[PDB]
């Protein structure tokens, strides 16, 4: 899955995803990617977020909408993103998931649930300061 958040220079935000799902999914299965608020969410008044991981689970917690909701109240992108991971973590401690957050001014962050097999999450960034697609990285909590 690929989740992407883009903030135009004007301040207009857009978000999106594309995926082929999970291997050997039951015929007709649809994950979180095409679901607004789960796979991705964008609002010019707050910010945008995109999620990736086990959509069967993420879908039930609407991670992208909640991340944007936190940012709506002034929360820092990384914090809004970690808080989202923490709530799911309370229900499914072994869930595979990563979320990227960005507020209306251009600040970004990310978070992922730490598994023995998943300890760090990389994501690409590109803005004015960085004149090259910069691969960021975060340790899972």
């Amino acid at each position: 899955t690929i989740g992407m958040v883009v903030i135009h220079k004007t301040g207009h935000i857009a978000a999106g995803t594309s995926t082929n799902g999970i291997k050997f999914k039951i015929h007709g299965r649809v994950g979180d990617s095409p679901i607004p608020g789960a796979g991705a969410y964008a609002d010019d008044t707050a910010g945008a977020a995109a999620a990736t991981g086990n959509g069967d689970i993420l879908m039930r917690f609407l991670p992208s909408y909640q991340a944007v909701e936190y940012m709506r109240r002034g929360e820092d992108p990384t914090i809004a993103c970690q808080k989202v991971i923490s709530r799911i973590q309370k229900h499914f401690p072994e869930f595979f998931g990563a979320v990227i957050c960005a507020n209306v001014t251009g600040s970004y962050g990310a978070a992922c649930n730490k598994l023995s097999t998943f300890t760090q999450f990389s994501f690409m960034v590109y803005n004015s300061e960085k004149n090259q697609p910069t691969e960021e990285k975060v340790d899972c909590i």
């Binding site: 690929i2 050997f24 007709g28």
Partner: protein, 161 residues
């Protein structure tokens, strides 16, 4: 200003690049998102985006995609898109040509054909192989539970207990 900004999941740099390029050419935030995601569909990023990957229990690759306009809060989305490669291209068309949010399955394939998309098999020798080795491992792993025969040991079809 720190804007424009492009952020995407995973080390998919070519997708980030296509998105930035879309912006540089005076493209909209939406144009950028579509460009970035479509790039991974063509490239089959990690085999987790686009055709020729993640075959379902029947060996078929089906795609899901979405695109959202933060300004109007309009959303175009497709789920279980069959036989159409440009999933996010179709999702954007749901946004631009209907007042609906989500279209799914073979019905969505028909919609896509009306919008000019090409109907084509999403399988490849690679994905079929992936599927066959799966049949060989007795359909392990799978996502069934509480059915007969035991999903943890055998393949399907399954029936309720």
């Amino acid at each position: 200003s720190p804007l424009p900004l492009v952020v995407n999941t995973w080390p998919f740099k070519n997708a980030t690049e296509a998105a930035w390029r879309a912006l540089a050419s005076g493209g909209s935030a939406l144009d950028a998102v579509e460009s970035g995601c479509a790039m991974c569909e063509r490239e089959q990023c990690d085999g987790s985006v686009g055709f020729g990957g993640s075959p379902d229990e029947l060996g078929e690759t089906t795609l899901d995609a979405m695109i959202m306009d933060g300004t109007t809060m309009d959303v175009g989305a497709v789920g279980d898109l069959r036989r159409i490669k440009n999933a996010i291209g179709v999702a954007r068309k749901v946004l631009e040509h209907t007042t609906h949010t989500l279209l799914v399955g073979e019905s969505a394939t028909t919609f896509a054909q009306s919008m000019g998309f090409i109907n084509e098999d999403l399988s490849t020798s690679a994905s079929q192989a992936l599927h066959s080795d799966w049949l060989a491992r007795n359909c392990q792993p799978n996502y069934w539970r509480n059915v007969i025969p035991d999903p943890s040991k055998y393949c399907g079809p399954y029936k309720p207990p």
